Curated annotation (Swiss-Prot), chain A:
Annotated gene: cas9
Inactivation phenotype: Loss of correct processing of pre-crRNA and tracrRNA. Loss of immunity against a plasmid with homology to CRISPR spacer sequences.
Function: CRISPR (clustered regularly interspaced short palindromic repeat) is an adaptive immune system that provides protection against mobile genetic elements (viruses, transposable elements and conjugative plasmids). CRISPR clusters contain spacers, sequences complementary to antecedent mobile elements, and target invading nucleic acids. CRISPR clusters are transcribed and processed into CRISPR RNA (crRNA). In type II CRISPR systems correct processing of pre-crRNA requires a trans-encoded small RNA (tracrRNA), endogenous ribonuclease 3 (rnc) and this protein.
Effect recorded for residue 69 to A: No DNA cleavage
Listed result of changing residue 73 to A: Significantly decreased DNA cleavage
Listed name of the protein: CRISPR-associated endonuclease Cas9/Csn1
Region (RuvC-I): 1-61
Length: 1326, 451
DNA sequence: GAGCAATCAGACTGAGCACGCTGTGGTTTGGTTGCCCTGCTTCCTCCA
DNA sequence: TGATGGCAGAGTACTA
DNA sequence: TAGTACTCTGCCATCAGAGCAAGCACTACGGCCGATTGCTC
RNA sequence: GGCCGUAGUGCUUGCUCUGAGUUUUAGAGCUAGAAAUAGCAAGUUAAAAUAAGGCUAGUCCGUUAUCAACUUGAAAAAGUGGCACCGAGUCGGUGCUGGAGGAAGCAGGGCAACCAAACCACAGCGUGCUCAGUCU
């Protein structure tokens, strides 16, 4: 037995580990090897790393689930429509629905005529001639008053119901309102009529252009206000305009309503708010509000339709028909123009589906943007195409009726068209008149987001309670589903519990009991001093009572001055009182109590005790429920308590926020001695005046024990469950689980003895988003920089360009404009100096012409410049091009600059980890490792857990020439773990006083101490520190510079490091989601059981779950003889369950006969095999191999490459270039090492020849460039899948191993999570 | 002619003997003894072939029988100094750990030779071959010792336990002596005149005249033959004045030193590493009893070996090396101590190193018995010369007890510090030096520097 | 006049208190130096 | 949002 | 000489959007704060 | 400072919806040529599927997490693998038992001298701060 420590380094996809002794030396032992090969033992160093694929979130799975539910519900809607229509469809045409169901079927497979609607070619052709598109039929049905065929009626209704619009806008949208400026003039007329004291005229004002502008709503409102005399922003007219356009204004100022008076037309609860406001203001302004409503309707309807509505009641269909006619006319004109002016490309343009153009636009997959890109130059190089080019620029050239922009059509337009059709055709068909309501409900029903899936107890993602067990249909959803209970469960299913008592639900934040608890908790910890008192005295129980009854229930905020005067001076009659232990103003107050007092107007009711349950229920309902209707239906039982007015006011009130203390914890539990609750003690507990923490931690009382028992008893879980339950990224959670498992195995390995120390460290860790953010900011600010020169997303990915665009092309420190073309010449300056903290995000980076304009070169920007650019940044913030924190940092100086305390804090954090994720990992490891208590039931710290930041190890490597290159091999994970252990152990040995802030368990003086915490490793600091380093108090030697550096160099240069890549069974989608056209191939997968791929298309490229080794016999040749064959079979994800259910039959179906169950071997991905002279290959799939060997380049060459390439960019730098120049001859040796390793293992002859030829031809280039390009060459000899790299100009493609036959005669190695335990299975015997 | 007369006593004729007299012995286990097992440590090729013939011969003799037991400790091929006999000795670490511990009774070599009186001049050295193998092991405790031996030629693979008591067991050297003791104990009752020295496995018979040794040898062979022990005849010095025993030459009743040993010490060149010097000192230290003033003579070399010192071979170390080389060349002949007569010890102390010689009366002269020398402890190093001699006597007087067997001697020293102990200018020293039963001071007189 | 937006009692004397330094004294802890043991450990022969 | 494994097609070569 | 069989190399990968609720982790301030002053409508 | 709030960013989980995209089919292609072939005409739309599918038959569920080998197990899960040293191209080799003797280093414990520091109590003093009196 020997004392040892385990060092770990955690990444998103790698977990290094290392065992060291007391002298910082990695041990080594022989490990037994199982299996059937001759080898029975193997020697391995106790240091390595585990590599695995990164974890994934559930976002994609959730999206897929939502899509599936959406498709199911759409099919159910169509089924409802067919069920309604069947009774008469049976008489009109019996097989109509049958023909519809089998439209997707070849002619031979069809059981009816190939024509769906009428069943005969003549009628089909006639119908398609009369109505070329479905919108023509919809308009004809809406407008005509004569009888129409039931089949066509059903077709139109089915289209409308299937493709409904968006449900964003709620309420009603009368399509008849389609004017913009005429209706605005009507509104102005009504405004003048009502408010005749002052005239308001909009003559000569482009109201239509102002309102229809593409700018922001606020910008449009500001422009309209500016272009209107006699009124300013926030006026009555301005508020009406804002309400009409969508903004939510407060009309309180307009009518001095002394209330919120905020009305958002779109929200339906605000419809009731508008109702109450009309109640307030009588009827005069009611008509004005109706006019505003009409205006808003007309605005949005014109925006989305752009067609007149008076002539026809089918505005959307008419617009689609107009678009169709324009498409036809434009197409004919373009055909004629091309044929006349340029007949050399009519073919390519209108017939070639491979290239873009009309043919690729219609028959091919080209989109509108690609079509416009292809057709623009031809249009420009022509004559008489001015209007065509104008339409192209306006995005109105050759448009399809069904397009990506059709997402702005509200479902109310489709509802209106459907209702018009139903009204027209209800006379001839009585059942259409009788089922109008239910058809419209079919169209306009959607399940509320709080009800969720309508399961029946067999769905995990389901919360719902049903008043009756009948089937749910949209026509009895209200009568079956208990929406109130559904919503309550919705909310309560995601809230948290009380950790003190992890069984009860937390209380609402604004709960009255919570308010009382906080008030008393803050009140019990105050002490006062008055004349004639020996010492300060705690607040008596009766004193607290009186104070609560006279101050908190009478004023919103309690201040110590009011406490002293209103009570101590008046009641206690002590003029001289000195309060202590409390701030001038108290933090907690009965905020909810005052809110209800002004509504219910019953102090007796609010103070009475027997209605506290009622009050708690009231606040719980208000917090839980968000919709007014459900709030009212829940408060119906309490309608008797308060009049209708009070009930309406309650429904208006809305509390949001959940507390952190369960009711049981606050009030239910009672002390055994006296049966007093926490609230009772807080009200009066003798004269000790203990607070909540003291009460729960007191040993004399039973609160502590009782809480502890409940917690521990109910606290049970498994490692995996707990790790997943933690909060963080799934990749980090996976890394944590892997780290725990490797720790357990390392402990098993080292004689089942727990380590003395465990040192851990974890690493810290869009173009479309940038485009949308910059677009929104430009629209908000009204700028035209994007219009000056549009920029694509790929270009915007550049950091410099992004900064330039965010700054609106102006310097952040001076009021000047920068030039885009003159970029790559200025400097990027962080707001906070890089020395204080390390942050290269956009939130801290600022681009300026000269970095010497931030005032002080270190402190935050200078005051004056900050003030001027502070107005400019208030502007940029209203524009949202910068964040709250960014603005704060930028404007910090004015309030104050970086103080010495701030510098100290910044530097301190850079060396101390405070992340909750690291704290959780450390706590888990501590609880697992240390489980033995002492005589006083106190855990004994047998093992100490230490957490370090990566900065210490990086500084160590840079300082003592241990440079790390990540592109050489995967040994750097293991090296980082080893260095982490070494540094942590040395630090805790040298400074035992810092265990508090490192081990899990004045400013100026602090500055130099933390800055020089790692100085004892250095030799010459000119101070000459002693060779040996003692603890400083005891005699323990912590660092002997004479040898420990030699030891570290030897350990980092060991050519054997256990790199193990975790084998995983592939899971996920069955195959690629693309549906390919029909072709004669066996790779296609049928999309349904009877849709033969060779006639209907299908998927392809199925993902293999795990390969299976099968030894059997197949039939080859006409003789059908049995030839012994051993081969790898890939069990795809789709057929995995079928294979597992009966492997014998699954294999026999594929053609193999007489398989061997014993010889069947399951091979997951990344399975290892050794061949030849140490060559190792991993298993990517049943037909491809990955590399599995690592190159152990000498540390001397590693350091030379680092220094020559200048990784991460005077006398110290002077010697580095001289050193490189002296050792120029290392590049040839590095190339030789790469060549020999590739010859021995990689076996890519052509790629090796190309690499060597490129190196020979590029021998004259600078050493810096040569080393930088040689760093790339290591991609040839790496671990994992082949990948393409580049050497100067020459590029080298992948060399893939698409054959998996040799591995069948190799040695199969099963490696544990650390790789020290192996099971070598020889496959040649099979 | 001796081989013919006693066919039942010689190992060449009798062969693998058996401890007929003693019953099978049960090996007790510690209170917490629990079965343990470990896979046999793979043995080296040449080492594997060394033990294989013995296993075949041990199987024939019945010592090794196939068995299946939960205890299985590996076998160790301890190569003999001569060639590589690779005796099959079990590692037996676990068993030694699991087995109990009993009181030991093996005699230390520094006393056996003390019992030999100079009167008996005729010697007979007998060595019992396979000594440990003689004692039988009860089948109940046989599973305790086992090892895995698989040879395709033999055709048997598994555990081969020991029916006797094998080598390595930490209590084997004790039981054999105890068991063999009572056996030879009665022989002394039959032949009180003779003086038989019972080593662990070497029996030396001392007699007065040549005929007395011959009579004892014939009687001794018959007794051992009946008892079942078998002695090797190849190396058995019988009725010879010059005999080799316990690493010491025995001639004219003097504990001579072998000429071959002296060659080894001088043969080595000047050491260059602390290991080399330790090897030399190890060889030298076995002969400390012959070199006068060995402690002061080799004083320089000691600190050269010091664990944390530098091997900067000093001229004083060279002078020290030469002193040992020349001292061993003319080493005197230490006589065998006679317990009947009183002893005499000379004590001297110079420069913090105590030296002296233990002598006994030989006619009118005194014959050296053993040279005693010691480094004084640092506390006594700083004492004045008058007090330093008192400490030197106590250190050397303790050494004499390990050879005189507690018998008193004449403490002779140049000074008269014997009265100083009574009235010093330390309580432990007074009791040791004032015990008239075990120590006394004769006439004060100087002594020759060589002595 | 009403609103939004920062800004965040001077001197002298006295007593009383806070940080630091100093003198006296009591107590506690710690250290070196010296003498003793107990113990543990490492290095070299001579034999089974 | 890049990888990295599947796929089709062209080329070469071995065998009935 | 035609039929399998293996190797090599370029291509290919379902995408946008809108609401609501809960939780965590982290960073920025502010707060006690009255009375005075400023300016602006 | 604590505490208290809030303001914002990011991320995670769940639910309800939208627009497209893809695949097969319907939308009679015509003329001259036996034919390939050539010339014209047409194009915008619709139906169905949107992971195969499952039983629990719901307007439900189906892509997240977890997973070396072997033994015991129904499963949840539990068990399975000597140490030391000299080395180093992916790890190689060597060693291993007792007893006895001689020499050397080491750490710990006790005891008696001498010494430092610390705390506390009293008293004094330099500097600074709060409060009170006076003038303003």
């Amino acid at each position: 037995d020997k004392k040892y420590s385990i060092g770990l380094a955690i990444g998103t996809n790698s977990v290094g580990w290392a065992v060291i002794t007391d002298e910082y030396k990695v041990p080594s032992k022989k490990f037994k090897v199982l299996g059937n090969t001759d080898r029975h033992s193997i020697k391995k160093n106790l240091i390595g790393a585990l590599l695995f694929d990164s974890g994934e979130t559930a976002e994609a799975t959730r999206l897929k689930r939502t899509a599936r539910r959406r498709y199911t519900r759409r099919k159910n809607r169509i089924c409802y429509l067919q069920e309604i229509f069947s009774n008469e469809m049976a008489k009109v045409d019996d097989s109509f629905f049958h023909r519809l169901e089998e439209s997707f079927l070849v002619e031979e497979d069809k059981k009816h005529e190939r024509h769906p609607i009428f069943g005969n070619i003549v009628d089909e052709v006639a119908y398609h001639e009369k109505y070329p598109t479905i919108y023509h039929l919809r308009k004809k049905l809406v407008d005509s008053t004569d009888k129409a065929d039931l089949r066509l009626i059903y077709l139109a209704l089915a289209h409308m119901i299937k493709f409904r619009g968006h449900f964003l806008i709620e309420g009603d949208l009368n399509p008849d309102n389609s004017d913009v400026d005429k209706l605005f003039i009507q509104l102005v007329q009504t405004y003048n009529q009502l408010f005749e004291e002052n005239p308001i005229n909009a003559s000569g004002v482009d109201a239509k252009a102002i309102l229809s502008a593409r700018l922001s709503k606020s910008r449009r409102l500001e422009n309209l206000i500016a272009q209107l005399p006699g009124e300013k922003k926030n006026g009555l007219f301005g508020n009406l305009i804002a309400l009409s356009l969508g903004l939510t204004p407060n009309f309180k100022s307009n009518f001095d309503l002394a209330e919120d008076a905020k009305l958002q037309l779109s929200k339906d609860t605000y419809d009731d708010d508008l109702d109450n406001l009309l109640a307030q203001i009588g009827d005069q302004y009611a008509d004005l509000f109706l006019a505003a409503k009409n205006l808003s309707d007309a605005i949005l309807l014109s925006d989305i339709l752009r067609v007149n509505t008076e002539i026809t009641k089918a505005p959307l269909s008419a617009s689609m028909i107009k678009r169709y006619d324009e498409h036809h006319q434009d197409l004919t004109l373009l055909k004629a123009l091309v044929r006349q002016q340029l007949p050399e490309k009519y073919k390519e343009i209108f017939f070639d589906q491979s290239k873009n153009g009309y043919a690729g636009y219609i028959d091919g997959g080209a989109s509108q943007e690609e079509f416009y890109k292809f057709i623009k130059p031809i249009l420009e190089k022509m004559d008489g195409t001015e209007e065509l080019l104008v339409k192209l620029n306006r995005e109105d050239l050759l448009r399809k009726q069904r397009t990506f922009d059709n997402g702005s059509i509200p479902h109310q337009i489709h509802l209106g068209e459907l209702h018009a059709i139903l009204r027209r055709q209800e006379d001839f068909y009585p059942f259409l008149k009788d089922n109008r309501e239910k058809i419209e409900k079919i169209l306009t029903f959607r399940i509320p987001y709080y009800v969720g899936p309508l399961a029946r107890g067999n769905s995990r993602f389901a919360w719902m309670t049903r008043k009756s067990e009948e089937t749910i249909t949209p026509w009895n959803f209200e009568e079956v589903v208990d929406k109130g209970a559904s919503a309550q469960s919705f909310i309560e299913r995601m809230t948290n519990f009380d950790k003190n008592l992890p069984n009860e639900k937390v209380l609402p934040k604004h709960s009255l009991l919570y308010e009382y608890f906080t008030v008393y908790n803050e009140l019990t910890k105050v002490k006062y001093v008055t004349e004639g008192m020996r010492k300060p005295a705690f607040l008596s129980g009766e004193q607290k009572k009186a104070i609560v009854d006279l101050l908190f229930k009478t004023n919103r905020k309690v201040t110590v001055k009011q406490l002293k005067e209103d009570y101590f001076k008046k009641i206690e009659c002590f003029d001289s009182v000195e309060i202590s232990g409390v701030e001038d103003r108290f933090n907690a107050s009965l905020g909810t109590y005052h809110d209800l007092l002004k509504i219910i107007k019953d102090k007796d009711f609010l103070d009475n005790e027997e209605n506290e349950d009622i009050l708690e229920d009231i606040v719980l309902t208000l917090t839980l429920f968000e919709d007014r209707e459900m709030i009212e239906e829940r408060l119906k039982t309490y309608a008797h308590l308060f009049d209708d007015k009070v009930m309406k006011q309650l429904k208006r009130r809305r509390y949001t926020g959940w507390g952190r203390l369960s009711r049981k914890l606050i009030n239910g539990i009672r002390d055994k001695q006296s049966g007093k609750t926490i609230l009772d003690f807080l009200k009066s507990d003798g004269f000790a005046n203990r607070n909540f923490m003291q009460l729960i931690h007191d040993d004399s009382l039973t609160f502590k024990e009782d809480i502890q028992k409940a917690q521990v008893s109910g606290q049970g879980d498994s490692l995996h469950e707990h790790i997943a339950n933690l909060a963080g990224s799934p990749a980090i959670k996976k890394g944590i689980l892997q780290t725990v498992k490797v720790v357990d195995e390392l402990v098993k390995v080292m004689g089942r003895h727990k380590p003395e120390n465990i040192v851990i460290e974890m690493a810290r860790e869009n173009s479309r988003e940038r485009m949308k953010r910059i677009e929104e900011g430009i629209k908000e600010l009204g700028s035209q920089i994007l219009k000056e020169h549009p920029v694509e997303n790929t270009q915007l990915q550049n950091e410099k360009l992004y900064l330039y665009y965010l700054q609106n092309g102006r310097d952040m420190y001076v009021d000047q404009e920068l030039d885009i073309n003159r970029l790559s010449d200025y400097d990027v300056d962080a707001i906070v100096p890089q020395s204080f903290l390390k942050d290269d995000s956009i939130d801290n980076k600022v681009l300026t012409r000269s970095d010497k304009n931030r005032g002080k070169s270190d402190n935050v920007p200078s005051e004056e410049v900050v003030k001027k650019m502070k107005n400019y940044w208030r502007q940029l913030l209203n524009a949202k091009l910068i964040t709250q924190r960014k603005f704060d940092n930028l404007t910090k100086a004015e309030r104050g600059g970086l103080s010495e305390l701030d510098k100290a804090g910044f530097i301190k954090r850079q060396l101390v980890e405070t992340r909750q994720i690291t704290k959780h990992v450390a706590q888990i490891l501590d609880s697992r490792m240390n489980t033995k208590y002492d005589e006083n039931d106190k855990l004994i710290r047998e093992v100490k857990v230490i957490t370090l930041k990566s900065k210490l190890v990086s500084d160590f490597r840079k300082d003592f020439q241990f440079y790390k290159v990540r592109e050489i091999n995967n040994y750097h994970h293991a090296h980082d773990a080893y260095l982490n252990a070494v540094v942590g152990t040395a630090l805790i040995k040298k400074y035992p006083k810092l265990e508090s802030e490192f081990v899990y368990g004045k400013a100026t003086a602090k500055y130099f101490f933390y800055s020089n915490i790692m100085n004892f490793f250095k030799t010459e600091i000119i101070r000459k520190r002693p060779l040996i380093e003692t603890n400083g108090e005891t005699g323990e030697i912590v660092w002997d510079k004479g040898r420990d550096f030699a030891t570290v160099r030897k350990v980092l240069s060991m050519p054997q490091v256990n790199i193990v890549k975790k084998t995983e069974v592939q899971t996920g989608g069955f195959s690629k989601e693309s549906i390919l056209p029909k072709r004669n191939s066996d790779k296609l997968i049928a999309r349904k059981k009877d849709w033969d791929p060779k006639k209907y298309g299908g998927f392809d490229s199925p993902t293999v779950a795990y390969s299976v080794l099968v030894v059997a016999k197949v039939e080859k040749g006409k003789s059908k003889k049995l030839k012994s064959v051993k081969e790898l079979l890939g069990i795809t994800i789709m057929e995995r369950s079928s294979f597992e259910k009966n492997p014998i039959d699954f294999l026999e179906a594929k053609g193999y006969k007489e398989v061997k169950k014993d010889l069947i071997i399951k091979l997951p991905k990344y399975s290892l095999f050794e061949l030849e002279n140490g060559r190792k290959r991993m298993l990517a799939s049943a037909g491809e191999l990955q590399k599995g060997n690592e190159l152990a380049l000498p540390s001397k060459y590693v350091n030379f490459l680092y220094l020559a390439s200048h990784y991460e960019k005077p006398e110290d730098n002077e010697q580095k270039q001289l050193f490189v120049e002296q050792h120029k001859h290392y590049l040839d040796e590095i190339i030789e090492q790469i060549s020999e390793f590739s010859k021995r293992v990689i076996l890519a002859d052509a790629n090796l020849d190309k690499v060597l030829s490129a190196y020979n031809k590029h021998r004259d280039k600078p050493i810096r460039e040569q080393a930088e390009n040689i760093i790339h060459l290591f991609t040839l000899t790496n671990l994992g899948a082949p990948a393409a790299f580049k050497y100067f100009d020459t590029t080298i493609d992948r060399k893939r191993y698409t054959s998996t036959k040799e591995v069948l005669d190799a040695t199969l190695i099963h490696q544990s999570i650390t790789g020290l335990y192996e099971t070598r299975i020889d496959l040649s015997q099979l | 002619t001796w081989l013919s007369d006693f066919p039942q006593a010689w190992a060449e004729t009798g062969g693998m003997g058996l401890a007929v007299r003693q019953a099978p012995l049960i090996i007790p286990l510690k209170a917490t003894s629990t079965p343990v097992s470990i896979k046999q440590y793979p043995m080296s090729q040449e080492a594997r072939l060394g033990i294989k013939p013995h296993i075949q011969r041990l199987l024939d003799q019945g010592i090794l029988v196939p068995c299946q037991s939960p205890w299985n400790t590996p076998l160790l091929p301890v190569k003999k100094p001569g060639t590589n006999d690779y005796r099959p000795v079990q590692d037996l670490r676990e068993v030694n750990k699991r087995v109990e511990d009993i009181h030991p009774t093996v005699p230390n070599p520094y006393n056996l030779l003390s019992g030999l009186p100079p009167s008996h001049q005729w010697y007979t050295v007998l060595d019992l071959k396979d000594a440990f193998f003689c004692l039988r092991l009860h089948p109940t405790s046989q599973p305790l010792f086992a090892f895995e031996w698989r040879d395709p030629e033999m055709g048997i693979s598994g555990q081969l336990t020991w029916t006797r008591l094998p080598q390595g067991f930490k209590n084997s050297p004790t039981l054999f002596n105890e068991a063999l003791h009572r056996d030879l104990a009665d022989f002394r009752i039959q032949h009180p005149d003779l003086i038989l020295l019972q080593y662990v496995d070497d029996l030396l018979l001392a007699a007065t005249s040549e005929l007395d040794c011959q009579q004892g040898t014939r009687a001794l062979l018959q007794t051992l033959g009946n008892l079942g022990y078998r002695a090797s005849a190849k190396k058995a010095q019988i009725c010879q004045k010059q005999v080799k025993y316990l690493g010491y030459l025995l001639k004219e009743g003097q504990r001579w030193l072998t000429e071959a040993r002296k060659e080894t010490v001088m043969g080595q060149p000047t050491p260059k590493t602390p290991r080399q010097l330790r090897e030399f000192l190890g060889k030298a230290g076995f002969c400390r009893l012959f070199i006068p003033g060995f402690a002061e003579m080799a004083a320089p070399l000691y600190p050269l070996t010091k664990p944390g010192t530098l091997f900067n071979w000093g001229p004083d170390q060279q002078k020290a090396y030469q002193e040992i080389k020349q001292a061993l060349l003319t080493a005197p002949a230490l006589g065998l101590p006679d317990l009947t007569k009183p002893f005499e010890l000379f004590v001297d102390e110079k420069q913090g190193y105590a030296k002296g010689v233990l002598t006994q009366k030989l006619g009118p002269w005194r014959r050296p018995v053993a040279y005693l020398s010691k480094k004084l402890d640092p506390v006594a190093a700083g004492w004045p010369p008058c007090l330093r001699m008192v400490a030197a006597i106590a250190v050397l007087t303790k050494d004499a007890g390990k050879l005189t067997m507690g018998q008193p001697l004449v403490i002779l020293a140049p000074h008269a510090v014997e009265a100083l102990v009574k009235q010093p200018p330390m309580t432990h020293y007074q009791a040791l030096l004032l015990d008239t039963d075990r120590v006394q001071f004769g006439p004060v007189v100087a002594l020759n520097p060589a002595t």
